[PDB]
Amino acid sequence: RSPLEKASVVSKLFFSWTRPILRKGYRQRLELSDIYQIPSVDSADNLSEKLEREWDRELASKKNPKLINALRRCFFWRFMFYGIFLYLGEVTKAVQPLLLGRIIASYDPDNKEERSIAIYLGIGLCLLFIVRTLLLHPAIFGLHHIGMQMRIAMFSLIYKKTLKLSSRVLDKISIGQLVSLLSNNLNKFDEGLALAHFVWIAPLQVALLMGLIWELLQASAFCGLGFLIVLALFQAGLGRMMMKYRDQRAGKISERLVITSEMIENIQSVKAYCWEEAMEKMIENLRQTELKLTRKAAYVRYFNSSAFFFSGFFVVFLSVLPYALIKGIILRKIFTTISFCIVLRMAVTRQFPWAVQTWYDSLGAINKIQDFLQKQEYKTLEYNLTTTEVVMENVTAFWEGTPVLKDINFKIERGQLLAVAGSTGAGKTSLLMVIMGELEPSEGKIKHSGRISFCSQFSWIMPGTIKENIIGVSYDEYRYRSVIKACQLEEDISKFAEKDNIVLGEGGITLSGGQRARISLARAVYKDADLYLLDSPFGYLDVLTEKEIFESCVCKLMANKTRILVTSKMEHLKKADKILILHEGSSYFYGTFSELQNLWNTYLRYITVHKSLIFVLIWCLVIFLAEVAASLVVLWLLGNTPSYAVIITSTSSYYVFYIYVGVADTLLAMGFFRGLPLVHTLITVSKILHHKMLHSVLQAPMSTLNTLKAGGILNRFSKDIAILDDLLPLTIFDFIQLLLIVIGAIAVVAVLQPYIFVATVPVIVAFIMLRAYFLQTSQQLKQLESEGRSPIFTHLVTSLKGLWTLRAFGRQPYFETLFHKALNLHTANWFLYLSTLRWFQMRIEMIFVIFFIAVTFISILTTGEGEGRVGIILTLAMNIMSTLQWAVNSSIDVDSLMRSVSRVFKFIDMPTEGIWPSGGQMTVKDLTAKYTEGGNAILENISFSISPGQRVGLLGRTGSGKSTLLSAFLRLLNTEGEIQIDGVSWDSITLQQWRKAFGVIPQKVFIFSGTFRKNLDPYEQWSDQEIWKVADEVGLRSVIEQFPGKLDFVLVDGGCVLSHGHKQLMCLARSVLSKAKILLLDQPSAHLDPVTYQIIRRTLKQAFADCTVILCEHRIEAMLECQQFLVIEENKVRQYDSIQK
C-alpha cells in the first residue's frame, strides 16, 4: 500500500513517487484523503518494541546503564552505511578543479596539452556531475529517515515510563516540565543528523586538498593552512560562549511561560479585577531581562557565522604572497588555488564547527532522557485472590514530622457500604491512597483486591465524545442507558445542540461544575470492578439532586457490591453499614451507626513595524553600492593598464574576471559595521510584536477567546515568539548576504561584457519557476504537519490528570495504543513534507547540471584556432550560478519561517472590548445572555430589581444558568439588554468604571506565583500600614505570620501551600482594598471547615454591613440571612420574599 515500498529501484532513487501529490496539491487544497499511509518500518509499535528490547538488556546485563549503548545496537550499521556514500560524494567535489581548471585554460592558444585533449575532459567532467548528483541526496535523505526513527522510538519509550512514575515522584515536578522535555528536539534531531559525519569527513577533506595545493604552491601551502587552524580555534571558543549564554537563560524562559499560563487560564478573573495593565508590566520586566542574554547569543552567533565570507581573501593572499615574491606567478595558478580554497574554507569553517556543536546537543539530549528513564517506579505487585474482602490492621503511613494516618483498621464483607467522615485535612483521601497501592504503608498490613474503580474528587474530562468519556473500551446499550438515567443526566444530555455526541475539549471548559461531576461519577460506576471508591462526589451537587442520585445509584444499582463512600452528611451515615471517623489522621470512632449515638504584504508589515529597521536596510544598500562602484573602476583601470611578480599576457587576460568572481564574496561581505546593527534591530522587532500580542489578548472580548482551542493561546507565546528570537534574525541575515553577493558579482562582470547577463537568464528563470511550483504544495503540507502535533501533547497532558484512575483499573495498554495512533498521524504528514523537500532540492541541482553539460560541449566545440569568446562567456556565467543555487535553497527556510510571523500578526488584529455607587440598588430589564455567538440563549428577557443593601439569595438546579447570571453582570459574555445601577444605564459609562464596583469571589481564586504583597495589589496602591489595617478585620494576621516572611513570602504553584479557606479570605480582603459595593459569591461551601467558615460570616456583617451581597448557596440551612430569593429554571428568573411560601 505505501507508495515508497511499492516503488521500483530506479524511481526510488530519484524520488519520482512524489509526483502524484505534487500535481494533486498544485491545483486544489489537500486534506486527509490522499495523505499516504506511513511505511511499516517506522510505525510506532515496531520502533518502540525494538528499542525497548535492547534498552532493558543494557540496564540488566551490563554494569552501567547507558541509553547511547542500546541506540547503537539498533541504528549504527545503517548510520555508517550512509556515511560512506556521503564521504564519496564530497570527495567528488574536491577533485573537480582538476577537470574544470584545464578546460578553462584550454581557451588560451598558448597551451598545447589542454588543446590536444579537451573532449576527454568534457566527457569525464559530465560523468563527474551525474555521479555526484545521484550519490549525495539519497545519503542525506537516509540520515533524515533514521533521525525520524530515533525521535519516535524515544518519545514512545518516554511515554511508557511516564505511566509508571511513582506517586512521590509526580508530586515534586511533572506535567509542565514533561511537555517541555519533548519540545526541544521536535525537528532539530532528524534534520540535525545529516551533518554528524562531517566530524571525520572534514579532516579527511583537508588532508586531500592540502596534498593537491602542494602541487601548486610548493611550501607556502602551510602558510594559509595555519590561518585556518586559528579560525578553527577562534570558532571553537565562540562555541563555549554560545552554549554558556544559551544554558544560562533557560531558567528565565520557563519562569515567563509558567506565569503566562496562569494569566491565560484565569483570564476571566483578570478582566473582572481590571488587572490588564499590571499583568503587561509584570511580563514586560521578564522579557527585558531575557532579552539581554538573547542579544549576547546573537552577537556570538554572528561572528561564528560570518567567518566563511571574511576568509576568502586572507587564506589566498597569505599563501600566494610568499610564492609570488620568490618567483613570478602566472594568473592561471592564482585562479586554481582560489578554486581549491573555496572547498577548503567550507569544510573547516562551516561544516566541522556545525558537526561538533551537533554532537554536543545530540549527546546532551540522550543523557537528559537517560536520567528521566530511571526514576522511582509505581509498584504493581498486589494481592490477587482475597475473596473480595478488604481488611486492614495496624496501618501507618507518611507523606515525607507527623504520620498522616496511624493504626487505622476496618473489615468490609462483600456487598457492604463504608462511610468515611472527618474534617478538612484529616486524611480522607490519603486513606484511599493506600487502598489502591499508591501509598505503600511503612509498617501496615492491608489486603488488596482485583480491579478497583476510583472516582477522584478532582473532575477528570478527556478529549472526545461525552459517551466516549463514559463507555471506555466496550459498549453496552442497556448498561449505558441505565447509568445515564441514574445519575440525573437524562435532562441535561438531550439539551445542548447535538444530543450526546458533543465534542468536549481538554478538561471540559464548556461544561458546568456539577455536570462535570456527574460525568466523572457516571464513568466510575459504569465499569465492572471488585470495589468502588467514591471520593466525595456530592461537592457540587445541590441537595435535591444529591438525594435522588444517592437513592437511585449508590443505594439501588450497586446495592450488592463492596463500596467505600467518603461523605460528611449526617443522613448518609445512617444508611451505611460501618462508619470510620478520622479525627486528625487517627480513628476517633469506628463502628456501626446504632452504637454511634451513645458516643506578500506580510513582509511589508514585518519590516515597517519598527520604523528603525528602514534606516538600517538603507544603510546596508548604500554601502553595497559604494563597494560595487569601487570594484567596477578598479577592474576598468586594469583593463587598459600596460617581468613583475604577476605574469599576465594579452591572450590570458580573461582570468581577471574569474579571479574577481572567486573573491567577490569577501569583497561584498557584511562587516561588523553592518551585520551587528542588522542583527540588533531584527531582535527588537520580536520584542515589539510580543508586546502588541500580549496587549491584544488581555483586551479582547471573551467570546473570541472561547472559540479557540484550550492550549492554543499559550502555544503562540511558546513556539512562535521563540522562533522570532532565534531563527529569523540569523536566517534572514544569511539569506540577504547570499543574495547580495550574487547581485554584486553579476552586476560588475556584466557591465564590462554585456553578454554574461543574457547567457545566465535561463538559469535564473528555471530556478524561479520551479520554486513557485513547489511552494504551493509545500506550504499546504507544512500546515497539516504543524497542526498534527497538538493532539499528541494533549494526550500526554490529560493522561496525567487521570493517572491515578488509569493505574487503579489497569488501562495502560489502551492509552499506549492511543498515543501510538497520535504519533502515526504526525509521522504521515512529516514524512511527505520531508520527501517533497528532498525532491525540490534534488531537481534544483539537476537543472544546474543539465545547463552545465550544454555549456561545456558548446564551449569546447566553439573554440577554434584561437581563443573563442563563447567559451569564456558561458563558462564564467555558470560559475556565478553556483551561488544562486545556494541562495535559492536558503530562501525556502525564510518562507517557511514567515508562516510563524503571519500567525503572530492575526492575534494582534483581534477586536477590542466595548461616588457613583450611592446605595447599590441594581435594576435588570430584558437581559439576554449567550456564551457564544449564535449558539443558544441561557437566559431570556430577565427582569428583576434589588433593594439597596439587601442580601439576595440565588438558587436553582445545577446546569441551569446559576453562574451565567453572575458573569452577565460583568458582561463577560455576549449580552443584550439594560442593567442600571442607581439610574446609570449599562452603556452610559466606560466599561472600566462598571467592573470596579463588583467584589467577585470565584470558585477558583486566581493566585499567581509572586510576593504576598504583590497578590493583594499588583498596582501597588496601598502602603504596608494600610494593608495591615485591612488584614485586621478579615483575620489574615495569623494566616500570613505562619510563613517566614511577612508580606515577603514567595507563593508558588497557585498558592498550593494555602488551604482553600485561606484563599477565600485572601480573595475577600482583595475586594476590601478596592472598596467594592456589590459582592458576587459562588458556592464557597464545598468542603469548608468551621475554623474559616465563621470568619466570612462576620465580615459580611461588619465591613459589608450596608453592601448588597448575592449569596449563591445550595442549601437553605446556610441561607438564614437572606430576604430576597432568585430561582433560575426553564430559562427564567423569578424573585421571591421571606421563607413563608
Ligand SMILES: Cc1nn(C)cc1S(=O)(=O)NC(=O)c1ccc(-n2ccc(OCC(C)(C)C(F)(F)F)n2)nc1N1C[C@@H](C)CC1(C)C
Ligand atoms: C513530470 C513530473 N512531475 N512531477 C511532479 C514529478 C515528475 S517526474 O518525477 O516524473 N519528473 C520530473 O520531476 C523531472 C525529471 C527529470 C528532470 N530533469 C531536468 C534535467 C534533468 O537532467 C537529466 C540528466 C540525464 C542530465 C540527469 F538525470 F542526469 F540529470 N532531468 N526534470 C524533471 N522535471 C519536470 C518538471 C515536473 C520539473 C522538472 C524540470 C524538475
Ligand SMILES: Nc1ncnc2c1ncn2[C@@H]1O[C@H](COP(=O)(O)OP(=O)(O)OP(=O)(O)O)[C@@H](O)[C@H]1O
Ligand atoms: N501528594 C501529597 N503530597 C504531600 N502531602 C500530601 C499529599 N496529599 C495529601 N497530603 C497531606 O496529607 C494530609 C491529608 O491530605 P488530605 O487530602 O488527604 O485529607 P482530606 O481529609 O481528604 O482533605 P479534604 O477533605 O480537604 O480533601 C494533609 O496534611 C495534606 O497536606
Ligand SMILES: Nc1ncnc2c1ncn2[C@@H]1O[C@H](COP(=O)(O)OP(=O)(O)OP(=O)(O)O)[C@@H](O)[C@H]1O
Ligand atoms: N464556557 C461555557 N461555554 C458555553 N456554554 C457554557 C459554558 N459554561 C457553561 N455553559 C453552559 O451553560 C449552562 C449552565 O452552566 P452552569 O455555570 O451555568 O450552571 P450552574 O448552575 O452555575 O452550575 P453548578 O451549579 O453546577 O455550579 C450549561 O448548559 C452549560 O453547558
Ligand SMILES: CC(C)CCC[C@@H](C)[C@H]1CC[C@H]2[C@@H]3CC=C4C[C@@H](O)CC[C@]4(C)[C@H]3CC[C@]12C
Ligand atoms: C588518505 C586520503 C586522505 C587521501 C590520500 C592523501 C595523500 C596521501 C595524497 C593526497 C594528494 C596526494 C598528492 C597529489 C599530487 C602529488 C604531486 C606528484 O608530483 C607527487 C605526488 C603528490 C605529492 C601526491 C602525494 C599523495 C597525496 C599527498
Ligand SMILES: [Mg+2]
Ligand atoms: Mg480530599
Ligand SMILES: [Mg+2]
Ligand atoms: Mg455554576
